[PDB]
Amino acid sequence: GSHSMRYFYTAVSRPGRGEPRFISVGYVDDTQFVRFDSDAASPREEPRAPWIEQEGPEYWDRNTQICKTNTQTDRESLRNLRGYYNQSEAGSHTLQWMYGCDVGPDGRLLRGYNQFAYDGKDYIALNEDLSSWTAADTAAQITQRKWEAAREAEQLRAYLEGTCVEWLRRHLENGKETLQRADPPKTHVTHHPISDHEATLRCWALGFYPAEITLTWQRDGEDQTQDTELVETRPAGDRTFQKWAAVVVPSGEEQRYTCHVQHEGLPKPLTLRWEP
């Protein structure tokens, strides 16, 4: 299928309680593979998936050095950002960074990403062209002007088209037993009487990987979008995910309702009914 490598960075200031904490994690698809935490006893790039552990000392040291330098840049940029918004030094603020690449079945670049948020709001993003910037506000325009003067987009493009895709392809091969294995959902419907005249039908999908899935209820073959309670897809803790969709049905009408499941690990979509 298609795949992605993404790195996520969070820096959080805490005035009066030391320097901003910097935590960053790396994912391939829905599998985390590294972390770095400036509050760790010994901050370093750490393995978080078995297949990455084979990488040599050079990998570990270079990524560690990168994260140490990034800790310092994020801290200085947080000071800049506070000034851009005329904010006092007394409050806590957040800077987030995500970048990475998506590739198709054939290993080729679909698109790259490089974007930031300040206090949970979009700040600046590299455009899909990997060449130009979109700034969310007049503060981000200051940053844009600096990064344009520095021709930073050009460095990012080289990374996203080259290094990113090359390392994703490497990770996919080293982790081929897991990263290239889709685990289909185990599915069933449960029935929960509410009152003499209604019951809940809940369609379950369990044990699936990757997280992307579609669960929908139909009544007489019509989608029940507005009448379906759909929980957020949640991690089980064993790499897999869980999800359910629930519908409130008049007593005796259960057989008019069908649950429909699509997931990459399934040859064809599944249709389920409550089976008393």
Partner: peptide
Amino acid sequence: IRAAPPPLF
């Protein structure tokens, strides 16, 4: 491998 840190904001 990770990308280099960006320039200062």
